[PDB]
Amino acid sequence: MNILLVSQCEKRALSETRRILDQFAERRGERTWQTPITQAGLDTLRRLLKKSARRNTAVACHWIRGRDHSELLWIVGDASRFNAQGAVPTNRTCRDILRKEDENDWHSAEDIRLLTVMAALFHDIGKASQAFQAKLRNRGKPMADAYRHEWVSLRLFEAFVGPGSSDEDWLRRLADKRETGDAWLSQLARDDRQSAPPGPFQKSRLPPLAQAVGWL
């Protein structure tokens, strides 16, 4: 079998490995050897190199198994000077070039941001009711409000969106800044009436995203 041995040692380790290896192979390069050797020779070479190795030793042995094929047998000493295939890096540096802190992997950050921001802009809208304002200005004995302000906000939002409509409808309507007018408050199904209207969360009342915003 013919093999190729390459050294990447440094400092005194280099002289030692040069001494040990030069007994078996002719020098084809400042750090490369190559020669036809038998199995026993290879085992004894591995043993000898293992015995006297240091911290700065890194020697790799490749076998030219046959046609268009060659394999890495073993690495003696430090294994961080080669990759799995036995190649070596071409250059090195300390300055980070991957700069992998800019990009994160929160795959739903934007959806959360949009849902929250839309929910924030409407959440406390119910505080415009006259009863709430009177309570704010009232200094005397307090009376608990007949309805929570969040429920009023939900009813106002439901009235605005318009029942049974697909998402794009109300989205487009809201986005159009020119459109203004209080003509959509006639659909405010008040819950004080004798007949209790259907709950806003039923299937025919709101589209999906509308319910997602309404829950928040």
């Binding site: 800019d102 990009e103 929160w106 795959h107 934007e110």
Partner: protein, 312 residues
């Protein structure tokens, strides 16, 4: 946006990456670069130029949305690599966002009929001889440039070529007429520029500045035509005028539409002023952009198919 019809944008000096599920561009000019107004939908295509990089996550997001991607060269030409467009037929109906094309069917529907190919070659030649007139006569900017075009001789040559083209029975006669018109236009431009006797050396062996300028303009125009066919979806091999054997025929056929009308004046002007390569390249790109060539190439290519199917 190179072409209004194609909806094709060009990006430079930018890193495309994703932050929290959204594609983001980082470039000088911060959060004011107009790259933030690029609709990401089925009807967009991105071309990345000088000083640009793209992450794997970004292209996952783009593929999810249905946006094609391509890497062009400095200024928009030539094209190095890009995605590929699939065909649209009754069968072969996969579920994906990418919008398919239909012009390959119409193109292949006549490329096998020799006479229809003859008609198409006639249309291409007619388009070229038409555009030569506009470029060489109407351009007030070119008139102010300095090279002086004599109306009489150019009109005589254009009329003679038009007569010859209308009466070409086979492809070889059309090629001979094309060569004659090219030589005559070469001579007219050489006389106008005072450059003196000039020739089109083979192999690009010509050492004179005119030779180098002509080769460079040719290279740029071929790149632009490659972009054109890719956008539309036709293959390069399916030549129309050239021989069926010559590889890349369709690119040169489409490229010829603008070459003799745009490149030719610029090379002689640069040689007269003796400018460097970079300035010549910039001038060619500027003239191509102003003339809105790519739009014309795309329009003509669609028009041929429309006429072929209407006459069917």
């Amino acid at each position: 946006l190179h072409s209004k019809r194609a909806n094709l944008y060009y990006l430079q000096h930018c890193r495309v990456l994703v932050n929290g599920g959204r594609v983001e561009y980082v470039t000088d000019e911060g959060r004011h670069s107009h790259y933030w107004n690029i609709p990401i939908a089925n009807t967009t295509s991105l071309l990345l130029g000088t000083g640009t990089s793209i992450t794997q996550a970004a292209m996952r997001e783009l593929a999810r949305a249905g946006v094609l991607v391509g890497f062009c060269g400095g200024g928009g030409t030539p094209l190095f690599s890009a995605n590929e467009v699939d065909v649209e037929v009754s069968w072969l109906t996969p579920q994906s966002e990418y919008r398919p094309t239909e012009y390959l069917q119409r193109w292949v529907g006549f490329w096998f009929d020799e006479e229809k190919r003859l008609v198409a070659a006639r249309h291409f030649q007619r388009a070229r001889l038409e555009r030569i007139r506009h470029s060489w006569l109407e351009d007030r900017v070119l008139r102010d440039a300095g090279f002086a075009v004599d109306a009489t001789a150019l009109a005589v040559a254009v009329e003679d070529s038009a007569r010859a083209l209308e009466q070409a029975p086979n492809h070889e006669h059309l090629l001979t007429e094309e060569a004659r018109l090219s030589k005559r236009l070469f001579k007219l431009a050489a006389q106008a520029t005072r450059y003196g006797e000039f020739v089109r050396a083979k192999r690009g062996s010509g050492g004179d500045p005119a030779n180098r300028f002509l080769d460079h303009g040719n290279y740029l125009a071929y790149g632009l035509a490659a972009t054109a066919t890719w956008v539309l979806g036709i293959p390069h091999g399916l030549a129309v005028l050239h021989g069926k054997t010559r590889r890349g025929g369709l690119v040169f056929d489409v490229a010829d539409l603008i070459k003799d009308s745009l490149i030719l004046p610029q090379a002689f002007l640069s040689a007269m002023r003796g400018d460097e390569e970079q300035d010549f390249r910039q001038a060619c790109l500027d003239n191509l952009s102003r003339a809105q060539a790519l739009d014309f190439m795309i329009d003509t290519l669609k028009d041929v198919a429309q006429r072929s199917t209407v006459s069917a």
